[PDB]
Design a protein around this nucleic acid. Structure first.
Ligand code: MG
Ligand code: MG
Ligand code: MG
Ligand code: MG
Ligand code: MG
Ligand code: MG
Ligand code: MG
Ligand code: MG
Lengths: 139, 109, 201, 125, 175
RNA sequence: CCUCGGUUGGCCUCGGAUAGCCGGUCCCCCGCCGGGGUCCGGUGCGGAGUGCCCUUCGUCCUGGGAAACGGGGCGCGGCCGGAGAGGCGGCCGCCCCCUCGCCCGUCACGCACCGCACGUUCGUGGGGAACCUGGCGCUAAACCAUUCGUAGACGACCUGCU
RNA sequence: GGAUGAACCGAACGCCGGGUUAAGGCGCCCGAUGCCGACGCUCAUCAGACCCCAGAAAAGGUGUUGGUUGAUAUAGACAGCA
RNA sequence: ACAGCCCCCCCGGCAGCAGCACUCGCCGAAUCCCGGGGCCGAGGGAGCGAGACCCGUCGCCGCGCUCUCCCCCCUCGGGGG
């Protein structure tokens, strides 16, 4: 049933807290509630971190547990987690949320105009397809 | 042309459990549900707009039934985005659960 | 808000939803709770039935016709629960109580409308998965409610009609996706604006 | 926005051909500054455009103390030929910079409004 | 004694010199306290219990916080303590996993309060020691000694239950 | 006229599970549409309520795109669906309009009321008396009095009266 | 403030505006946690829920959670079957 | 070893330093600048001087310029060093 697991080398996304919006690697597990956590390439120094503010991703790095920053950083850079992360639908959904949030009034006006025209064209095509499908006569 | 004011609800007066300070009112602004989001609305003018029986003079217009009690947001209240408002006269108690307009007037943005 | 807030009672905990609804109607908001037979109560069914039977026992000894009115429908049970969180002996509380409507099943005004959900009152997130719970409809039926069967039949008809409507909506959305694929050279100019400003990933 | 005057009132003109706002004073407390800007450097705002230029003019009430005959004349404010010339002179060099950036003129033609879902504290201007 | 996130303090004290011993011995203790004022108070409590010293007849020559020498390493802590129950006094040995010794002692105080209703004034921490993973005795601590540890997060409860307060979609607990 | 004021865009709907879901598609079975078995996608829900839709300055020259199998009818007539409180919704036929409304441009104009509030909607709002204007329609009961006695303190009740 | 209350807890009082607290609180009544609060314990077919205070004991439980001491076990424990 | 971990080293080197990669403190003679919201405006003859005369732009405190002269940079005498 489960596909994403808490384990050494698993890359997690920080949902909230001081490090929200960042990627980290799980270096070790502490007492079912916390994990020794290290983002050497995403600017999260080694520290404890609760599992509540983690959202596991699909990337697993291969380093032994409680390895140093050097080995975590080499595991991160080789098979680059930054670009592979940015390529995912998750990361660009986050990016779309951010750029929708930072949109100004003129940008909202332009989006309103473009969306108006786009919706009208799509609706005309939908009506055309409906009438094309309404010409069915078969016993 | 457009609404141009934020909707708020007159939730009640500033009060203890068994004491009520009617000189200041509590407003629930729609869409503001955290204390840190209330900083925009501090100092903004707010109006309680209502209708009555007799006509009253309208600034820049003909007399009508509309009357206003003016006020402004003074500070935040609670952690959940309440605000406190001081009006020129204390709000009537029939206005509890009714519309208050936050007018964006003293803009700082 | 200014519209009527329609809340689906299925999967919701009684007191949690009632506290939310009471605060909403005290803030001057129209609230309509549908499908009150689907409301859950934490704790096992025998315990909750015992609580309601104690409530049944509480009656006025001199003249029970004046005493507490024990309402057996799930909608009326939820209504009385909300009244217990409202200040119903003042004019403000009575107006707040008037701003609330409760129904068993989903009546024709509201079966054709979208229904909201309160996560802070949902059983799935507010209750541990190993704990037991009771259904308000079953409790009401076994404590005196008479219309469990007819409400179930009407709910099943409503669900069949909703399935038909949902199939129509799915077919329309498939046709819309096909339309977007059909017109893309005349759409990409505005699609790029939307993508640039974060709408439409 | 063009310039702050000597009294701190802003002098603005959403060009009259766009949204019917002439060269007009306004208070910075009662405006919202958006992020969109047009480079109106090295345009020439005429020097006579001052607070005394934009101050309101009044007629009443000389040689008349008790009102028995209606004095509602002159209530029609008249636009001066000088004001029309100034508006033309400013707009003639404001408008080409507006048209230089796409669909800014439609933005200036439209008015601002609060849709039911949008909130000014989350809006970026 | 209340709590917070406790800190370790090295507290060194001694009796005041008298014309019986010009150089009284120096005594050192580890005190886990919210702050240095409480640390000094607990030092005087403990040395009054052990030696025949008082705050008035003695002085505190040093009170400094002890920083953890490896806060980036998960390690096992055994704690020997004693406490007063409602009906007697008992000695306990408890085990925890934490990065810091002070964090482990804070975990101990919370756990004693949770399981035995023991308030912090009843608890006397008498030894704290980092132990090897083979020396551990508590299975709840031992089960995390896996080089290939792996578990999911089965039933993730929605914590943002009020943003939004009202919504159309029901939450998902599977991730 | 009199009176009561609120409000200041809409969402027209699967069922649900939560140690799982959602979407799409080829073969089997039931009336050309659904149910299964594959297979392919998505899943910190993007076929997303942290969403979607509509979007209000108005016109006049004036070009390029969208459309042109198109929009409007408080225009008529017909049909269908909806009963849980249907108080609603959808589809056709005739007729009458404009080729305008949607996007990007060209062109100038409107009280530009000289900084200022209750502005902007629902709305042709609800309710009550009354006047005028036309069309199409209706001509009743209840109570008292009387009688009854299946009833009864009195009321009430059961009854009868070209 | 303790729902309520001569005595409890805070604090003592001219008529007011603003700020901040005490004791006590912050699901709703009812102002305030609508914190993505922390760690555990607990299921009650009479659960529990805050000084005074408004109800309980001895004695039990193979319910569950910790802890103390002791013992057996690959020279094969323990439990089952013979 | 075809990964790593802990301690002592014969000794370290560079950067940064209670970190602007939000791991963990106490502070400011070792501390300053800027901004926003709210409430308020009580008082009313402050002139040692001219012998006041238009309503004392006054006391304390902190400053600038001139009663010296050279230069420098922008305006067209004014402004800034
Ligand atoms: Mg009291
Ligand atoms: Mg009490
Ligand atoms: Mg005391
Ligand atoms: Mg006060
Ligand atoms: Mg209380
Ligand atoms: Mg409250
Ligand atoms: Mg520093
Ligand atoms: Mg004064």
């Amino acid at each position: 049933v489960f596909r994403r697991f808490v384990e050494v080398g698993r890359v997690a996304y920080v949902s909230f807290g001081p490090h929200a919006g960042k990627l980290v690697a799980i270096v070790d597990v502490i007492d079912q509630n916390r994990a020794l956590v290290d983002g050497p390439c995403t600017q999260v120094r080694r520290q404890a971190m609760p599992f509540k503010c983690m959202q596991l991703t699909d990337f697993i790095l291969k380093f032994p547990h409680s390895a140093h920053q050097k080995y975590v950083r080499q595991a991160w850079q080789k098979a680059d987690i930054n670009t592979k992360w940015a390529a995912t639908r998750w990361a660009k959904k986050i990016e779309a949320r951010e750029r929708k949030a930072k949109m100004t009034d003129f940008d909202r006006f332009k989006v309103m105009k473009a969306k108006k025209m786009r919706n009208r064209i799509i609706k005309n095509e939908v009506k055309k397809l409906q009438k094309a499908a309404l010409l069915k006569a078969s016993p | 042309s457009g609404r141009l004011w934020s909707k708020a609800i007159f939730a009640g007066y500033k009060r203890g459990l068994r004491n009520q300070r009617e000189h200041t009112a509590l407003l629930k602004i729609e869409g503001v549900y955290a204390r840190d989001e209330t900083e925009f609305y501090l100092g903004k003018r707010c109006a309680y707009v209502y209708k009555a029986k007799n006509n009253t003079v309208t600034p820049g217009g003909k007399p009508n039934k509309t009357r206003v009690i003016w006020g402004k947001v003074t500070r935040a209240h609670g952690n959940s985005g309440m605000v406190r408002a001081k009006f020129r006269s204390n709000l009537p108690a029939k206005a509890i659960g009714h519309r208050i307009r936050v007018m964006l007037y003293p803009s700082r943005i | 808000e200014v519209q009527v807030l329609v809340l689906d009672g299925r999967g919701h905990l009684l007191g949690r939803l009632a506290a939310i609804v009471a605060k909403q109607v005290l803030l001057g908001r129209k609230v309509v709770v549908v499908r009150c037979e689907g409301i859950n109560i934490s704790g096992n069914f025998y315990r909750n039935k015992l609580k309601y039977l104690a409530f049944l026992r509480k009656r006025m000894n001199t003249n029970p016709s004046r005493g507490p009115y024990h309402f057996r429908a799930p909608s009326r049970i939820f209504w009385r629960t909300v009244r217990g969180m409202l200040p119903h002996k003042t004019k403000r509380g009575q107006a707040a109580l008037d701003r609330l409507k409760v129904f068993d099943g989903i009546p024709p005004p509201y079966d054709k409308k979208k229904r909201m959900v309160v996560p802070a009152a949902l059983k799935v997130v507010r209750l541990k998965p190993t704990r037991k719970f009771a259904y308000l409809g079953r409790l009401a039926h076994e404590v005196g409610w008479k219309y469990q069967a007819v409400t179930a039949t009407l709910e099943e008809k409503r669900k069949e009609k909703a399935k038909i409507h949902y199939r129509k909506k799915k077919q329309l959305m498939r046709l819309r996706k096909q339309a977007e694929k059909n017109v893309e050279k005349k759409i990409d100019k505005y699609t790029e604006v939307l993508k640039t400003h974060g709408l439409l990933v | 926005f063009l310039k702050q005057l000597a009294s701190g009132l802003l002098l603005v003109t959403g060009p009259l051909v766009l949204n019917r706002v002439p060269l007009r004073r306004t208070h910075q407390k009662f405006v919202i500054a958006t992020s969109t800007k047009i480079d109106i450097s090295n345009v020439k705002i005429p020097k006579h455009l001052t607070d005394a230029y934009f101050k309101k003019k009044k007629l009443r009430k000389p040689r008349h103390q008790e009102g028995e005959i209606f004095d509602t004349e002159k209530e029609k404010y008249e636009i001066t030929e000088q004001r029309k010339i100034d508006q033309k002179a400013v707009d003639s060099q404001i408008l080409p910079k507006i048209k230089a950036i796409p669909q800014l003129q439609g933005y200036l033609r439209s008015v601002f409004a609060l849709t039911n879902g949008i909130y000014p504290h989350k809006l970026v201007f | 004694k209340a709590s917070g996130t406790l800190r370790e303090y090295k507290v060194v004290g001694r009796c005041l010199p008298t014309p019986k011993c010009h150089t009284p011995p120096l005594y050192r203790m580890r005190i886990f306290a919210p702050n240095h004022v409480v640390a000094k108070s607990r030092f005087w409590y403990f040395v009054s219990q052990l030696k025949k010293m008082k705050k008035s007849s003695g002085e505190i020559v040093y009170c400094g916080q002890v920083f953890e020498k490896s806060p980036l390493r998960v390690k096992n802590f055994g704690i020997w303590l004693r406490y007063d129950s409602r009906s007697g006094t008992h000695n306990m040995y408890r085990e925890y996993r934490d990065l810091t010794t002070a964090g482990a002692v804070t975990q101990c105080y919370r756990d004693m309060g949770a399981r035995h209703r023991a308030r912090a004034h009843s608890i006397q921490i008498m030894k704290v020691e980092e132990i090897a993973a083979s020396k551990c005795r508590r299975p709840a601590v031992k089960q995390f000694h896996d080089s290939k540890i792996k578990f999911p997060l089965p039933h993730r409860v929605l914590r943002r239950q009020h943003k939004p307060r009202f919504t159309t979609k029901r939450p998902n607990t599977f991730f």
